[PDB]
Every structure is written in C-alpha cells, then in structure tokens.
C-alpha cells in the first residue's frame, strides 16, 4: 500500500501549477469572460511550449509516453485555475483513443497533430434527451452519418470530433472533421460558460478509414471521460475550498473573523472531508485504470466528484456571501465550473446507478 503518486506526476503537476498561476490571474479570467468562445489561447500556447501536451501522450503520436496518472495530475492542476483548454477532450480522450484503437493512418495525421497542439480534437459522447443515437449507413466508399450529439466540449473550436454511431455491424466510433459536408456545429450557452457545442450530422459522409474502431472505443472513452472530469473537479474544489478558508480567516463580521464562528468551521471541515473523499477515490480509480473491471472504482470517484461538487460549490458561495456571486471577484466561477462537471457526469445519481447495476449483476 502506497499513496505517493509518481515522480513524473508530481513534476508535471508542479509545472502546470506554476504556469496557470502565472497566466490565470483574476484579471485574465475577466478577459476570458468577454470571449464568444472561452478558450484560453495564451495558456494553451504556454502549455504546448512547456511540453505539457506531449508529456503524457503515447510515443506513437510524438509524446513522451507517460500515462493516466500523469494525465490526472495535469487535470487536477488545470482545475485549480478553471483552465479553459481542451487537454481533456483533445489529448486525453481523442488522441488517446486514436493511439489505442485507430489505424496508423488516423494516428499519424490527426493523432500527432492533437498531441502537438496544432489541431483540437474532441469527443461527442452525449445525446439530446429523448433522441436516439447517430446512425451510420454503409455506402460504397464508407459511411453516411445522420444524427446529433450535444454538450460537446470545445465543439465550436474543434478541428474534428470522435462520434459514436450505430452501424449494421453494431456500434462504432467515427472521426468527423469540422469541414466535412453535412456537419454543423452550434455554440451552446451552459452553466459553466465554457466552449461547448451541439453537433448536427445530416448525411455526413465519411470514408471507411475514418472508422476508429468498434464498441470497445465508446466504452473506453466513457470510462476515461468520467475519470478525467473527476480529476479536473478535484482541482476546482480543492482550490475553491482553500480560497473560502482564506476568506473566512479574513472577512470580519461581529468584530471577528467569520471563520471563528463554529457553524462556519463545522461546514468547512465537512468540505475538507468531501474533497478528501474525492481525492482518495480519484487516486484509487486512476491506479485501477492504469492497471488496464475498473468501471466500479471509476464510478465511485465520479459519484464523489458530483457529490462533493454540489456540497462544496454551495459552501464556497454561502460562506463568501455577496462576494461569492459578484462577477468582479473570481469566486463565482468555481461554482459554475463545479456544477457544469457535476451534471456532465450524469450527477451523483447517474454514477450510483452504474455502481448499483454492477452490485446487482455480479454475485455477492
């Protein structure tokens, strides 16, 4: 038993924290608020230049070959400052799937370009409520895809999307370029105010070589998506909680720090407990996925990301009072980011449902 993360994870995490601390000042966050698409190009360029994208990407795509633990470390460090960059979508998920499942042809063009930061890839796992999956009809040269996918992270600024769809052979995942005919991306306005899109495929033709793989690709993407968003959530909540503690030591009412009222301390301690729970379950889940079954440990940590998310986001705001909602202060964005991820995970209940099914199906 040993909870120390790798030396490479600690080094990456530390370097990313130095970078986001320098770049994501309170003023910088306010400037990002004015963009039509919240994508922090300055940050992204500094991360590319420092080697962050290539560090935990496969050697086949030009990376240094670190893996899931190091990706988790980067995501937690990014979360600290609500980083508006598609590390998760492009490197962890899209490039990860090309490297694991895709042809050398998909790797060497799209894969390599994602890892170098020249292109932005994303994945489109979520459907609109009440609608069925994307349908992929077989043509001569390939496929025609018809359907929609929503809540696509960085959709409006992405070069291409990995899209699950039903085929005559069963489920598969296709790479669909933003410029293919029959492809339309519509910007969405979400709680978190991030870059998010709706993807409409209206007979979008794709060549056979755009098929990344079969049903195993979507499963892997689902798992890593929960894990990765859990990591980013930890960073959001860890920093949020710390900011709130520091506020409670500073803000005085009734001639004393609000942090000296036992009601406030009790609530902030429960926050520490929630964040610690998230931290520990994320650690277990990440070690399990690195093992390479993990589904239940991942869902446990996902539950914690949603659950700590709800309680800690509310605590952050309540203890700050007016300052917690005033958009001249940085506090408010921690609530928004925590909530966007809470429901991107399907909520506490969606994650508990995946756990409960496993407990039902596998004999005790």
């Amino acid at each position: 038993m040993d909870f120390t993360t790798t030396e490479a994870a600690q080094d990456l995490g530390g370097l990313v924290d130095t970078i986001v601390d320098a770049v994501c000042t309170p003023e910088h966050q306010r400037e990002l608020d004015k963009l039509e698409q919240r994508f922090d190009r300055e940050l992204w360029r500094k991360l590319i230049d420092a080697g962050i994208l290539s560090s935990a990407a496969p050697e086949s795509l030009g990376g240094d070959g670190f893996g899931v633990l190091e990706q988790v470390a980067v995501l937690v460090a990014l979360g600290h400052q609500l980083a508006a960059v598609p590390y998760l979508e492009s490197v962890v998920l899209a490039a990860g799937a090309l490297a694991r499942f895709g042809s050398p042809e998909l790797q060497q063009g799209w894969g390599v370009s994602a890892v170098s930061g020249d292109r932005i890839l994303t994945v489109a796992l979520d459907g609109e409520m009440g609608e069925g999956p994307v349908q992929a009809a077989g043509t001569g040269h390939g496929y025609r895809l018809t359907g929609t996918r929503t809540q696509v992270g960085y959709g409006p600024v992405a070069d291409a999307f990995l899209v699950p769809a039903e085929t005559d052979s069963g489920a598969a995942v296709f790479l669909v370029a933003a410029g293919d005919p029959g492809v339309a991306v519509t910007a969405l306005a979400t709680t978190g105010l991030g870059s998010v899109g709706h993807l409409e495929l209206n007979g979008a033709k794709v060549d056979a070589a755009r098929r990344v793989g079969g049903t195993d690709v979507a499963v892997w993407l689902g798992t890593l998506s929960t894990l990765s968003r859990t990591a980013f959530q930890l960073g959001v909540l860890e920093r949020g909680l710390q900011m709130t503690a520091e506020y409670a030591r500073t803000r005085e009412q009734f001639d004393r720090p609000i942090g000296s009222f036992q009601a406030v301390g009790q609530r902030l301690a429960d926050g520490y407990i929630d964040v610690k729970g998230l931290r520990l379950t994320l650690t277990q889940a990440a070690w399990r996925v690195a093992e390479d079954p993990a589904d239940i440990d991942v869902a446990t940590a996902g539950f914690w990301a949603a659950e700590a998310g709800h309680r800690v986001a509310h605590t952050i705001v309540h203890v700050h009072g007016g300052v917690g909602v005033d958009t001249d202060h940085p506090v408010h964005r921690y609530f928004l980011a925590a909530k966007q991820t809470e429901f991107a995970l399907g909520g506490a209940t969606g994650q508990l449902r995946r756990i409960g099914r496993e407990l039902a199906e596998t004999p005790a």
Binding site: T150, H198, F254, A344
Partner: protein, 386 residues
C-alpha cells in the same frame, strides 16, 4: 381547522393568474431580463391597485389579509413579475407606522400608484450580516443632515427616485455599537453628492454600489426618531408582514419537469418518468416543497407568528431550493446545464436559471446560520453561542 384555500382565495388566484399572464408576456419578460419597461410595468400594477392590496384602507389600500398577500407573492413568482416588494411591504408600512404626516401624504399615494420608486440602502462593504456595523454617517447642520459614506448591493438603483438609507447619527458621541443607534433617511437620487456604479452577479440580478459625498437632506426626511431606526429596518415590532420564501418556483419547476418526463422517451423507448430513480427525485422535491407551502400558509394565517417559525421557513426554504434544483437537473440529464436562450435549452432553461438565482437567498435576508441561532434561542431556549 382548514388546510386549503377558501373559495374567495381561489378566485383571487384565478384572477391573478390571468392578470399576470396578460402582464408578463414574452415580450415584456425579454425586455426586463436584458441589459421604459420596468417603470411602465410597475405603474400598470399600481393603476390596477395591486401595489396597495395589503395596505390598510385608511392609507388607500384594499385592506386584504396576509393570506391574500401570500397568494399575490406566489402568483407574481409564477409569472416572473418584478413587484417591488421591499418598497410596498417594508418602506410603505414603515412610513405608515412611524412617519410624519407630510411623509404619509406625499409618499404613500405615489408608491401605491407605482410612480415613485425606492432602493434599499442598508448594507455596506463592512456591514453585511452584521448590519449594526454600518458606518455611513449623518451629521446635523441646521435643518439638514449631511450624509457621508457608501452602501453596497443597492438594488434597482437605476430606477430609484429615493434611497431608503440606514445611517449612523451622532457619530461624534461614539455610542456603543450594541445600542444600534441608527436612523432612517429618505434621500433623493437627484441629490448633489450622490452617485452609483453597477454590480453584476452570477446569480443573475444586477445591483449596485451607492456613494454619498456630503449629501444634504432635510431633517424632515428622517423617518422615525433620531437613533431609533433599528426597529424600523429590522421589523423588530412586527409593523410588517413576515417576508416569505415562495415555494411557487420549486413547484413550477417540478410540474414542468414532471410533464416533460411523462412525454419524453429514454433510449429503450420507455417514458423517462417510468424510471424509479426519476420518480424518487420528483417525489423528494414534492414532499419537501409541501413543507415550505404549509409553513408559509401557517405564517400568513397567523397574522404575531413566532420568530422561530419565520426563521425556520426561511432556512428550510432557501436550503430546499439548492437541493430541489439539483434533483430536477439530474432528471433533465444532458439538457440540465443549458441556459435560457441557449439553443437546446429545455423548459426555457428555467431550472438552470433558478439553481443560480436561489444562491442569493441563503445568505440574504439574514444568513441561515443566524436564522438557526434564532430558532435555537427562541424555540428551544438555548443560550447564546458567541
């Protein structure tokens, strides 16, 4: 014993439901919820008699009950109508109870008509929950007070004709803070030395900071006696009706999500509402919102109601909102975080909108920790904790 509306109350509900549906059209809402309409809307409600519904007949009102007022609050909440509750439920009855005759004749009918607007100037950067810490000062100079300081969170100031301003009189004496020796002044927003700057929130509403630089107002603008304003601003002697947290938005969101889940399929082709998990979420919302409905009915029918029950309702209801909108958002799935006016928003983004709007209520209106201290002391006899 009766735990339901009387026929007359039902008729009032029907009347208000229809009234607000004609008043709060999509066009009027669009206009109010974006960066003319606000003043026209209030003047219309004034002409129609709704602003003074609850005032005594002696002061031009209809003399209606606290239950009728509760109905009115709920139907306004249902429609999104921007009723200036603090002006009509606090400023005006405070003038009725403690004002001079000249204040009564000038302000009351112009408030009732909806032609005169107030903002509440209580809070400061150093006086939030601890309102007794306010430092904005008013110094006597002849037949005037000279006012210096600043307020924070001064809402609706861009429409205001006057600030209802809590000030510290006799700053010279250094009277102990524990005496709460403040006064209330009516300050016109045309006064020289007055200015304001906008404040934006993530919760939704805009508000302001207001500033007072040697602002001169007549001593005749003081409401109540010098240094006796604390009771005015905290409803210490119950000259106002209890401020209620309406359950109508929680029930409305529940109703709309419920209806949507009845008419929407999951992957398998089953109605969404036919899942047990969805039913449990909606049920929890129902069973908890019933408490907020009932406690408010009791409070309104009790009109004093115990300060413990007023505090209980406020804590319960504002905590509940955070919980209820969460449970509902889980049901809405991939649509949950789509804001009003995003493509793909469901139910007009009402649930997402409320989950952010309700954030101000837990720490507003006396923060929930202080409310619970009141419940403990008043209802349970507990000793002071600080």
């Amino acid at each position: 014993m009766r735990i339901s509306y009387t026929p007359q109350q039902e008729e009032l509900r029907r009347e208000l439901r229809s009234y607000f549906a004609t008043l709060m059209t999509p066009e009027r809402r669009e206009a109010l919820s974006s960066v003319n309409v606000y003043r026209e809307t209030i003047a219309q409600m004034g002409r129609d008699g709704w602003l003074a519904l609850g005032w005594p007949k002696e002061y031009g009102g209809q003399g209606r009950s606290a239950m009728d007022q509760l109905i009115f609050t709920d139907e306004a909440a249902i429609a999104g109508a921007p009723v200036p509750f603090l002006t009509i439920n606090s400023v005006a009855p405070t003038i009725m109870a403690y004002g001079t005759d000249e204040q009564k004749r000038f302000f009351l009918p112009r408030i009732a008509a909806g032609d005169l607007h107030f903002s509440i100037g209580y809070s400061e950067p150093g006086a939030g929950t601890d309102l007794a810490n306010l430092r904005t000062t008013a110094v006597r100079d002849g037949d005037d007070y000279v006012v210096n300081g600043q307020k924070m969170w001064t809402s609706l100031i861009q429409y205001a004709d006057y600030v209802w301003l809590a000030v510290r009189t006799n700053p010279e004496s250094s009277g102990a803070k524990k005496h709460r020796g403040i006064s209330v002044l009516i300050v016109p927003t045309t006064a020289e030395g007055f200015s304001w700057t906008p404040v934006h929130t993530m919760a939704g509403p805009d508000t302001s900071a207001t500033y007072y630089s040697d602002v001169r107002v007549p001593v005749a603008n003081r409401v109540g006696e010098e240094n006796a304003g604390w009771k005015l601003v905290t409803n210490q002697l119950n000259h106002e009706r209890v401020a209620l947290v309406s359950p109508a938005p929680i029930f409305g969101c529940l109703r709309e999500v419920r209806e949507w889940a009845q008419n929407t399929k999951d992957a398998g082709g089953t109605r969404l509402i036919d899942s047990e998990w969805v039913q449990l979420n909606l049920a929890r919302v129902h069973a908890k919102a019933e408490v907020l409905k009932l406690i408010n009915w009791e409070l309104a029918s009790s009109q004093g109601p115990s300060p413990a029950d007023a505090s209980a309702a406020k804590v319960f209801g504002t905590e509940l909102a955070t919980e209820a909108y969460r449970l509902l958002m889980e049901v809405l799935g991939t649509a949950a975080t789509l804001r009003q006016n995003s493509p793909g928003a469901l139910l007009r983004g009402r649930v997402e909108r409320m989950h952010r709007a309700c954030l101000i209520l837990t720490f507003g209106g006396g923060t929930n920790e202080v409310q619970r201290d009141i419940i403990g002391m008043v209802a349970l006899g507990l000793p002071r904790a600080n």
